[PDB]
């Protein structure tokens, strides 16, 4: 079977349409229970939503959102708006077009051109950046020795090299927000030592979810994020300072 990869800002409450294989046309139907209708209507933009998701019809791993080509969706006979322009594949909030009643069915008509694709619908709670931050801080702090070993590595001179890096420089300020770091974080896959502010980075992806490193522009998914232990200890010792300089001998001082 096909499963979707969980979204960091969405907690699945129920599955309304299980992942189902898709100028082609396919018709879908689903119903909400009175309890599910009550959850939506009392969630104030609603915080409990109906989420439509598309992906590749692949089984080896949980799938990320992937729109089929020439996608055009109709929810309850009404044209469903998609992300602007190539078009980025993302979950679709169909709550504004949903029939928020237990007494009537909801209809989805999908048009695309032919690889196989899959469609699924979920009842979700949209989480805040604050909640996602607390979930991140709950995974703990990365060993400060992991950064110390990375610093040592980068300052280890290549023997068949003329120009050798004798010292590294990092900032204690966020490269995105310009204020001093509170939660210094980075993706595990990033090669650089420069961290960015975790709270600010989640505040940004709450609105527009690009999950892109503000330092190197590589992918920085939520599930790859760590809190640098070394920068956590420095942020506690250091005071009137912007940039730190690291030596080979392990020492550090202002830059
Ligand atoms: Cl660790
Ligand atoms: Zn990066």
From Swiss-Prot:
Subcellular location: Cytoplasm; Nucleus; Nucleus speckle
Residue sites binding Zn(2+) per the record: 190, 192, 213, 216
Organism domain of life: Eukaryota
Glycyl lysine isopeptide (Lys-Gly) (interchain with G-Cter in SUMO2) cross-link site: 154
Induction field: By dihydrotestosterone (DHT) in prostate cancer cells.
Post-translational modification: Sumoylated.
Free-text comment about domains: The PINIT domain of PIAS3 is required for STAT3-PIAS3 interaction and for translocation to the nucleus.
Family (UniProt): Belongs to the PIAS family.
Record's subunit section: Monomer. Binds SUMO1 and UBE2I. Interacts with BCL11A, HMGA2, IRF1, MITF and NCOA2. Interacts with STAT5; the interaction occurs on stimulation by PRL. Interacts with GFI1; the interaction relieves the inhibitory effect of PIAS3 on STAT3-mediated transcriptional activity. Interacts with AR, PLAG1 and ZFHX3. Interacts with STAT3; the interaction occurs on stimulation by IL6, CNTF or OSM and inhibits the DNA binding activity of STAT3. Interacts with MTA1. Interacts with CCAR2 (via N-terminus). Interacts with TRIM8. Interacts with PRDM1/Blimp-1.
Protein purpose: Functions as an E3-type small ubiquitin-like modifier (SUMO) ligase, stabilizing the interaction between UBE2I and the substrate, and as a SUMO-tethering factor. Plays a crucial role as a transcriptional coregulation in various cellular pathways, including the STAT pathway and the steroid hormone signaling pathway. Involved in regulating STAT3 signaling via inhibiting STAT3 DNA-binding and suppressing cell growth. Enhances the sumoylation of MTA1 and may participate in its paralog-selective sumoylation. Sumoylates CCAR2 which promotes its interaction with SIRT1.
Protein name, per record: E3 SUMO-protein ligase PIAS3
Organism from which the protein derives: Homo sapiens (Human)
Gene from which this protein is expressed: PIAS3
First-to-last residue of the parent protein present: 126 to 408 of 628
């Amino acid at each position: 079977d096909v499963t979707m990869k969980p979204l960091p800002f969405y907690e699945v409450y129920g599955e309304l349409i299980r992942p189902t294989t898709l100028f082609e046309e396919a018709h879908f139907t689903f119903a909400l229970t009175p309890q599910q209708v009550q959850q939506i209507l009392t969630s104030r933009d609603y915080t409990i939503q109906v989420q439509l998701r598309f992906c590749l019809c692949e089984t080896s791993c949980p799938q990320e959102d992937y729109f089929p080509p020439n996608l055009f969706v109709k929810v309850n006979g009404k044209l469903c708006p998609l992300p602007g322009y190539k078009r980025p594949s993302r979950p679709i909030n169909i709550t504004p077009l949903a029939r928020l009643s237990a007494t009537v069915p909801n209809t989805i008509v999908v048009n695309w051109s032919s690889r196989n694709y899959s469609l699924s619908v979920y009842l979700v709670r949209q989480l805040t950046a604050g909640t996602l931050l607390q979930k991140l801080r709950a995974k703990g702090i990365r060993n400060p020795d992991h950064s110390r070993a990375l610093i040592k590595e980068k300052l280890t001179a290549d023997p068949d090299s003329e120009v050798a890096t004798t010292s590294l420089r990092v900032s204690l300020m966020c490269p995105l927000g310009k204020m001093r770091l509170t939660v210094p974080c980075r993706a595990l896959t990033c090669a650089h030592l420069q961290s960015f502010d975790a709270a600010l980075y989640l505040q940004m992806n709450e609105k527009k979810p690009t999950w892109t490193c503000p330092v190197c522009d590589k992918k920085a998914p939520y599930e790859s994020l760590i809190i640098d232990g070394l920068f956590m200890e420095i942020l506690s010792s250091c005071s009137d300072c912007d940039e730190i300089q690291f030596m080979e001998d392990g020492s550090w001082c202002p830059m």
